[PDB]
Prior knowledge:
Layout: H1 5-13, H2 26-43, E1 50-54, H3 60-67, E2 71-76, H4 79-92, E3 97-100, H5 103-110, E4 114-120, H6 129-139, E5 140-150, H7 160-168, E6 172-183, E7 188-192, E8 199-205
Parallel strand pairs: 1-2, 1-4, 2-3, 4-5
Antiparallel strand pairs: 5-8, 6-7, 6-8
Helix pairs in contact: 2-3, 5-6
The structure holds S-adenosyl-L-homocysteine (SAH).
Binding site for S-adenosyl-L-methionine: 35, 55, 76, 120
EC number: 2.1.1.222, 2.1.1.64
Enzyme class: transferase
Amino acid sequence: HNVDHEEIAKFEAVASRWWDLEGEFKPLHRINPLRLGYIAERAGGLFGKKVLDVGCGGGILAESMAREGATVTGLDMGFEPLQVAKLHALESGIQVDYVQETVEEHAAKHAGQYDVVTCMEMLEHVPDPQSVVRACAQLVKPGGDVFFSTLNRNGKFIKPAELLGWVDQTSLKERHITGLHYNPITNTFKLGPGVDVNYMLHTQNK
Ligand SMILES: Nc1ncnc2c1ncn2[C@@H]1O[C@H](CSCC[C@H](N)C(=O)O)[C@@H](O)[C@H]1O
């Protein structure tokens, strides 16, 4: 129900390109060590934790979290991205459980089961983002961590201030927020203050 079929078709159409490091998803590949490092730091490590990756797509974050010893469920509504995720995980020799369903359906069946829920670059593609925020809150264990982010911009952006309003209506507490910026001194992208055009948000279930 809470799905934009057009948005899904778009990602389904480019699913084969997902793991091309120089293709359309290059920014996600480049960003991933950073968000993975952020998640591991904020959640206090990922080893042996149950982790749900909402709108996992081709599995860029999901696979990498499983590599750190997390028990990862990847969720998406796109058929082809999940086919690609499943195959790529097998090619890597990494175990990830990939499922095709909405986060609301998953929440109704798996409430409170996850130590960590990640929801990256997904919200802007959803007809009703508040519902996704509510589901993530429902999915997470007490004391669990929920992360939201939009680190990739191009040619629909949910402002962080608006997302905070959504988080405030749930059992999730905002813990930390940071932006992604180019650092000329180090010639690298780094997480830091300033969320005008992108962000990463750490919330914790209370
Ligand atoms: N309503 C919905 N339910 C589940 N997945 C959705 C969705 N709307 C969009 N998506 C998925 O969200 C993904 C956005 S691309 C982001 C991929 C991944 N989260 C990452 O950052 O690495 C696409 O795979 C798309 O199919």
